[PDB]
Amino acid sequence: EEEFETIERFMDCRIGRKGATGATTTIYAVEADGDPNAGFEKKEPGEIQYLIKWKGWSHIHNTWETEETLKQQNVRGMKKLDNYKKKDQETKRWLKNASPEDVEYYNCQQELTDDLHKQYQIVGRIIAHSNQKSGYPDYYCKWQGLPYSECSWEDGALISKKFQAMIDEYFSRK
Template identity: 50%
Template structure:
């Protein structure tokens, strides 16, 4: 078993290990800030060429998620670099190494099918880690206290990361986000400047007398996807949309229920879109869904559709 030296950390500004994500046999010195995703993209991977090295020339390295930092700032570290940096949370590394020893013992005795299943799970986890480094949405911005290289006060953006909850949002430097996600910043300012964002004025329209119901005989153009305008609502889906609009116009509560896979999601999106385009009601809308669907198809489709309105 590899031993990790435990040391007393007095520095209150020391970085803290939140989680050890995975490990590798890497080139000695291919650790620290140069191994962050953005530095690798800009300057190249310091671990490049590891495949041609003799195993005896390599060292075990660990991918670290740091407390208070997004996955974009994950770094590869060795035992030596961690022990020499006075980082906090070193116990988590010790526990990870113990689990590695247990895993190696399990693999020496487990059936091949179980090992293949485990490897598939690890591949899925690696794909998720890549998603965690993608910007899903820019929520807010602020002027940083620190100045950039030009001597100007930089802008920071509050980032909602893909496949992670809002509790994991982080403030990131403008230059860093501009590198790969400039479009998300543009979308953010487009939303800010939009005249159809939900506000107190149009929210008051919910209290006015509802308009008379006008049946939709065919799917309106505003429901046609920009990517594929040839897609059509099915007859029963258009009927469901009309039913929702009719109930809304009469101020009646209703529940849209149907078999799984028949399009309740698209009917819900179409209903909100119809309120937006037909009655100039821009929201805000309260969407209540099970937690299990918050990162699923419903939430993603609904979010993307509402983005088109704004």
């Protein structure tokens, strides 16, 4: 009965251009067609958007979404939206009177943290390849900064467009 998608974790929130969310927001889509939030200023409306890590999908499939888009798609695990907001309002709050020292420590940590999350969308190594095919076999990828328990199967055409090197090395391994 129908297909849902479910929120695993909230990766980030920002103010972005109306409509700049969902499947045209994945970095592989952004790299391919551009960023729907590219322009965005102030000049036009604002919309709080949440970057989403989906259950069953690797980080490259993260997309920006809004509280509205989530409900239009029947996405599950929304109780997780209430906690995130709460937490976020709380820290933007704290950020109001934070020591100059504390704020600095805050910025250094989020910088580092943000770098790690960026790695998750990078193929650190191709470890297998299906032989079904539609000519592009699927590849089992090992993600940078993540355990092997996070490896995932990914469309070959898509992974090759950016991690060709990683798949040529895989084959040189025989």
